[PDB]
Amino acid sequence: PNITNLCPFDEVFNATRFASVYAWNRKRISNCVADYSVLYNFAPFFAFKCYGVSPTKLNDLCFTNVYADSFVIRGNEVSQIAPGQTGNIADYNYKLPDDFTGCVIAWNSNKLDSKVGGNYNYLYRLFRKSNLKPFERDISTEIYQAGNKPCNGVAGFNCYFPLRSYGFRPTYGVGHQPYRVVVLSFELLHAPATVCGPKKS
């Protein structure tokens, strides 16, 4: 069987523009052949930690849908993209379930996401009433009511705007440089699994 119709991992990993972690981008991947060779080949990756499946046997065990979640965070928070973790990103921006089957990939992106004036186009949610459920997004810009008085839509004392900017600059320390993260989540359903890796003969 010849190999064709590869899954669009170039679209996710090599995108010119990633998303903020509060509005993290999710792309579904189906009805194609997914080869994980290209990802392993790529050297700059800071974390390639995988959960529930081995990285070596990605190409043979196959799944029904593959979700690629792309966002940008700061280096110190890359540890928060894992099951069972807490922080601003885990509680309010991007939550993984405790039974997460998939991989997390992160790499440094100074040359693409850092500006000398400061890149103010990457945002994160700092305040939220309750923790996020797994695989949930919140793109609401409602004023966070931290006190007892109603905010009435206007910020001020005890009423803060929840979205704060990741002001990335190239001279930051390694814990604060922009890191691009792609989370691959694999799921199996009752439908026939149509995302399967290459075959050899």
Partner: protein, 595 residues
């Protein structure tokens, strides 16, 4: 829902905005300091203005949270730091007058030019020429002319300014629920709310007194020895029973005695431990000097330098075309950015200074995990103390033989140890009575213990009684003799040097017992000892989150200032000074018998 959770959320928002604005301010200040150009000046001014306005509005929003219902110590500490009014408590007219007074004191001190009468075509400034004529000249009347002329001119132009300054600062402190401005300065050491580690503002003075009472015998012997050597320099002017003449102390003010090493050398025949020739023979560039300092810091177990440190620091003077500030400064810009501004020369002094500033950077690096408003030393002494211990360890003959600067066939006899310890004593023990005297005079003048028309008479008397230095001629109230120093004229706390000096040797003993050093304290090196680095890093990681008493208990196992490490450091020099002061008279009289 409660006040404490509101305070925590407010502090989170403040921490994010503060770190961004602080980074912009620090980057603009760095761009001015490494590149002195007018657009950089206005950029630094604009960023500083936005930072000051930001702290003004955040303190205004921060004072809406009362502290009596907050039980978490870290949140309470951050809110206490944030809610300080500063100079904002006054009226706008009085605040503007106070800033005008501080600015004009700064301009008078910076641009103070004093020169010879009858030759006014050009005149000499303090920093290029007066320092050289005070440190290098051996002529009595020349030093007398420079000393009297500078103090006369600066005192007459600064005395009413200080007269208004003490009243305005006293009103500022009393409006801020402090007893006096001295109490406001002593508030840096105040610890409240922690059981067993409580430290009062009022206690510091007796603690300083309690330490100085044990400083006093060693200093007396050193004073006697220095006096004897100055008798060799000046035959008839100095009395055996009296104090030292003020303009013979090697500096403009008598703060440091380190310029007297040539006159007061114990053994002139013995060579020094200067390794500059070894650096120039082996072509040690500034980059490799900092690499050697980094190797020292990874030997003790501390983390190595960041990549951004090597990329962004300017460790060499750039050239004639680009002007930069040559002062050695360690910069913590925030957001993981650490830099050193240093115009390095290939000398042993710059090598030791590089170790000192990298110690500053390591101290800044360790508390990066802390919240923004707690990213400082536990008190004002710790930050300089942790750099001075590195300067102590790097200057040892063992460390210089380890890294190849000093030959393995170098003989370390007792005579070179005595002269090295005397150089260290002139730098360290010499400044302690001057520092304690100056701070105690400032504390009483802020307290109102000293009457307004009795300042100079009191000050000189204490210089006779504490420092053992006599004035050349009597000075009336037309002079302002304290104000000739940089720190007092520009509103700086001065007790940090005394506390830093004590904490330096306390930390040195704690690290040397941690590293299992079996000899005298001055020979000790903390290199190749991971446990000593861990013991120090336990204090470094805390920052300002814990009381300074608790950090001191973490390092030395004591919660209070101790003078025993300092006297233990200078013990062989103390025995030697006791040996050679048999013929001379130890101690001084307050009479004007020398002059």
């Amino acid at each position: 829902s409660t006040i404490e959770e509101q305070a925590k959320t407010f502090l989170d928002k403040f921490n994010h905005e503060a770190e961004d604005l602080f980074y912009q301010s620090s980057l603009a200040s760095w761009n001015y300091n490494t590149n002195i150009t007018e657009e950089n000046v206005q950029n630094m001014n604009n960023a500083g203005d936005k930072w000051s306005a930001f702290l003004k509005e955040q303190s205004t929003l921060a004072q809406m949270y009362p502290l009596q219902e907050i039980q978490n110590l870290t949140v309470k500490l951050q809110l206490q730091a944030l809610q300080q009014n500063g100079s904002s408590v006054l009226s706008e007219d009085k605040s503007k007058r106070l800033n005008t007074i501080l600015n004009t004191m700064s301009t008078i001190y910076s641009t103070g030019k004093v020169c010879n009468p009858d030759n006014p075509q050009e005149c000499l400034l303090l920093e290029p020429g007066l320092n050289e004529i005070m440190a290098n000249s051996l002529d009595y009347n020349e030093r007398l002319w420079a000393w009297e002329s500078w103090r006369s001119e600066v005192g007459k132009q600064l005395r009413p300014l200080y007269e208004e300054y003490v009243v305005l600062k006293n009103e500022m402190a009393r409006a801020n629920h402090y007893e006096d401005y001295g109490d406001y300065w002593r508030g840096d050491y105040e610890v409240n709310g922690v059981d067993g580690y409580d430290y009062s503002r009022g206690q510091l003075i007796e603690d300083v007194e309690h330490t100085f009472e044990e400083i006093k015998p060693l200093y007396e012997h050193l004073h006697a020895y220095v006096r004897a050597k100055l008798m060799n320099a000046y035959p008839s002017y100095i009395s055996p029973i009296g104090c030292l003449p003020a303009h013979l102390l090697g500096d403009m003010w008598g703060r440091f005695w380190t310029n007297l090493y040539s006159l007061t050398v114990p053994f002139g025949q013995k060579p020094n431990i200067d390794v500059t020739d070894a650096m120039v023979d082996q072509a040690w560039d500034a980059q490799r000097i900092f690499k050697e300092a980094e190797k020292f810091f990874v030997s003790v177990g501390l983390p190595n330098m960041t990549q951004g440190f090597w990329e962004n620091s300017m460790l060499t003077d750039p050239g004639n075309v680009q002007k930069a500030v040559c002062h050695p400064t360690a910069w913590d810009l925030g957001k993981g950015d650490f830099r050193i501004l240093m115009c390095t020369k290939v000398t042993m002094d710059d090598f030791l200074t590089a170790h000192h500033e990298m110690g500053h950077i390591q101290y800044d690096m360790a508390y990066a995990a802390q919240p923004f408003l707690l990213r400082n030393g536990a008190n004002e002494g710790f930050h300089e103390a942790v750099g001075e211990i590195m300067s102590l360890s790097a200057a040892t003959p063992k460390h210089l033989k380890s890294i190849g600067l000093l030959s393995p066939d170098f003989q370390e006899d007792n005579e070179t140890e005595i002269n090295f310890l005397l150089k260290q004593a002139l730098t360290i023990v010499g400044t302690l009575p001057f520092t304690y005297m100056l701070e105690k005079w400032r504390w009483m003048v802020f307290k109102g213990e000293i009457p307004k028309d009795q300042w100079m008479k009191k000050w000189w008397e204490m210089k006779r009684e504490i420092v053992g230095v006599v004035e050349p001629v009597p000075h009336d109230e037309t002079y302002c003799d304290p104000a000739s120093l940089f720190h007092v004229s520009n509103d700086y706390s001065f007790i940090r040097y005394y506390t830093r000096t004590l904490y330096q040797f306390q930390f040195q003993e704690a690290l040397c017992q941690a590293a299992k050093h079996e000899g005298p304290l001055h020979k000790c090196d903390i290199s190749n000892s991971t446990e000593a680095g861990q013991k120090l890093f336990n204090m470094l990681r805390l920052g300002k989150s814990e009381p300074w008493t608790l950090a001191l208990e973490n390092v030395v196992g004591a919660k209070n200032m101790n003078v025993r490490p300092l006297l233990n450091y200078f013990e062989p020099l103390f025995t030697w000074l006791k040996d050679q002061n048999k013929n001379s008279f130890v101690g001084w009289s307050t009479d004007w018998s020398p002059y």
